[PDB]
A paper describes a structure:
The DNA genome, along with the baculovirus basic DNA-binding protein P6.9 protein, is encapsulated by an enveloped, rod-shaped nucleocapsid; the major capsid protein VP39 and some additional minor proteins are known to comprise the nucleocapsid. Here, we show a 3.2 Å resolution structure of helical cylindrical body of the AcMNPV nucleocapsid, composed of VP39, as well as 4.3 Å resolution structures of both the head and the base of the nucleocapsid composed of over 100 protein subunits. Surprisingly, the C14 symmetric base had nearly identical features to that of the apical head, except for that in the central regions. Both the head and base could be further segmented into three parts: an outer shell, an inner layer and a central region.
The asymmetric unit of the helical cylinder is parallelogram-shaped, containing a VP39 dimer (VP39A and VP39B) with local 2-fold symmetry. Asymmetric units, which contain two VP39s, are related to each other by a rotation of ~18.5° about the helical axis and a rise of 44.1 Å along the helical axis, generating a right-handed, 14-start helix. At the center of the VP39 dimer, cysteines (Cys229) from each VP39 form a disulfide bond. When taken together with the intra-asymmetric unit knot, the C-terminals of VP39 form a series of continuous interactions with an “S”-like shape, linking the neighboring helical starts together. These disulfide bonds lock the neighboring dimers together and are likely critical contributors in the assembly and stability of the helical capsid cylinder.
Residue numbers in the entry:
A (entry chain A), B (entry chain B): 14 to 320
């Protein structure tokens, strides 16, 4: 009934022109992700999806998982999914989109100086006190109201030190972790919640048993933020297919369409019926997870967690 | 209209007891495989499935791929998918099933001595010449009629040397291959066709472009046949779930159901709607493929192929 996306309250606070809100209907779900899918695929290279864990005794249990939207020939900056604090202002080219987007992003990355600069650049204009002040305060309040819940510290911490989620394999039966954990713990609580819900483990630990869902990692935590780079090998094929983009003619991309497949393949598809198609898009997979015996996985209330 | 599975012609040539034929309806498809899915999952640890390849210019192209039916705690013999000539009679305990099954398996692995022994053991019985003679010729003729088509040599070879399928990564832009290729070329044409349609490459080569579908291998070619052992790590999780088994109560397995998941997770599934479920089962993925420029992939007529 109520939207639960940070970008859902985006407003072009000129008080004259209306504003957009392209959030998909899944934003209203209490899934734990606080970004609508459209904003997830437009702002970052991610896409919500679910990973179901089965058994032999007919039991269902599912955990969320993200997906790449990056291709092959894109290298460097274009491979970045969630840039870190140092490398976000350059990759989001913030002087292009709306002012409220800049405010939201600067709140996300704890850049208070940018917030003050946008506020005092807004202040000098005519008609600020009419509606701009109240609208910018409403946007700020909504962003804070979404940011605090994801934050672990807050006023009174509802933190559950149960799911030891380490994005590394060093002393698996311990709390020892590499610099990846230090980099991951350097994000805002919203960022940590998003990256925790986005990437699913390839090794899992419940009670005393060990589970495995992949053989090699897919992404890696870097100083340039979360980057979709396969370790030790050429980048994985990703067909991109269809995704939304800002189409208002500011500038056009070259794209340089890598594949065309000019041949005809109607008969081959016709002769192969439903065989559980198993789509070949590349999902995220990184890290080692440990679950304590006492913990529960049915806490629908969004709890930031901490390892 | 006509079944294209070897095991579809299985008949208990006693002329008194009726015969079984549990092939699924997909056996009648001209999909390239020559084993019904039911026999595929009952005799070997495979299950047919398809894998579509996309582009950016709205084109479709799909190739076959097999699936594991092996769990985690199974080690050694139970990890064997398609046993080789040396290690097939021990793993298939051939003295337990029907005689015709033994004949088929001995024809598959070019064990002519076993064929002659089964024939001259059948010869001495009463009523052999009445109908058992013609039934054993019927079974032999059908098995040979399926075996020769997959065979490359035969009478006149319809072999195409365009697809270079290497189950190794050594001198990718060359014909050099490791011992895996030598072991693979030691199988019957039926076996080669099955393992060619079962495992899909992790790198693909069309013209000059390089494609990728996995970051690390899943199975490995051994002297003990095709064994489903992931390299460099613990065995992958596989729920097994529901599969057919010989249900006549001769003996009962311990199974030792590994997971039970006593917890309740109805609400967690309720709060997550359709999010591209992405099933987490383990498919086969091994080898490097090269496609020449002029080759075609719409040949409905099955061709054994040779690298």
């Amino acid at each position: 009934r109520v939207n639960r996306c940070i970008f859902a309250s985006i407003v072009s606070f000129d008080a004259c022109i209306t504003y957009k809100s392209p959030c998909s209907p899944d934003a209203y779900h209490d899934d734990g992700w606080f970004i609508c899918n459209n904003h997830l695929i437009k702002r970052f290279k991610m896409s919500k999806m679910v990973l179901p864990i089965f058994d032999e005794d007919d039991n269902q249990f599912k955990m969320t998982i993200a997906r790449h939207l990056v291709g092959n020939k894109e290298r460097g900056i274009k491979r970045i999914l969630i840039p870190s604090a140092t490398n976000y202002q350059d990759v989001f080219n913030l002087n292009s989109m709306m002012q409220a987007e800049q405010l939201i992003f600067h709140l996300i990355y704890n850049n208070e100086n940018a917030v003050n600069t946008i506020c005092d650049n807004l202040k000098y204009t005519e008609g600020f006190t009419s509606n701009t002040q109240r609208v910018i305060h409403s946007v700020y309040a909504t962003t804070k109201s979404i940011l605090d819940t994801t934050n672990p510290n807050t006023f009174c911490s509802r933190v559950s030190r149960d799911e030891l989620r380490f994005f590394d394999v060093t002393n698996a039966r311990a709390l020892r972790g590499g610099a990846g954990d230090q980099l991951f713990n350097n994000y805002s609580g919203f960022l940590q919640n998003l990256i925790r819900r986005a990437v699913a483990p390839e090794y899992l630990q419940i009670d005393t048993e060990e589970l495995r869902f992949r053989n090699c990692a897919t992404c890696i935590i870097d100083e340039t933020g979360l980057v979709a780079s396969v370790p030790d090998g050429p980048e994985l094929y990703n067909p991109i297919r269809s995704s939304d983009i800002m189409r208002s003619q500011p500038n056009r991309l070259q794209i340089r369409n890598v594949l065309k497949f000019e041949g005809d393949t109607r008969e081959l598809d016709r002769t192969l019926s439903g065989y559980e198609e198993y789509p070949t898009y590349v999902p995220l997979f990184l890290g080692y997870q440990i679950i304590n015996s006492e913990n529960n996985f049915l806490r629908n209330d969004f709890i930031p967690r901490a390892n």
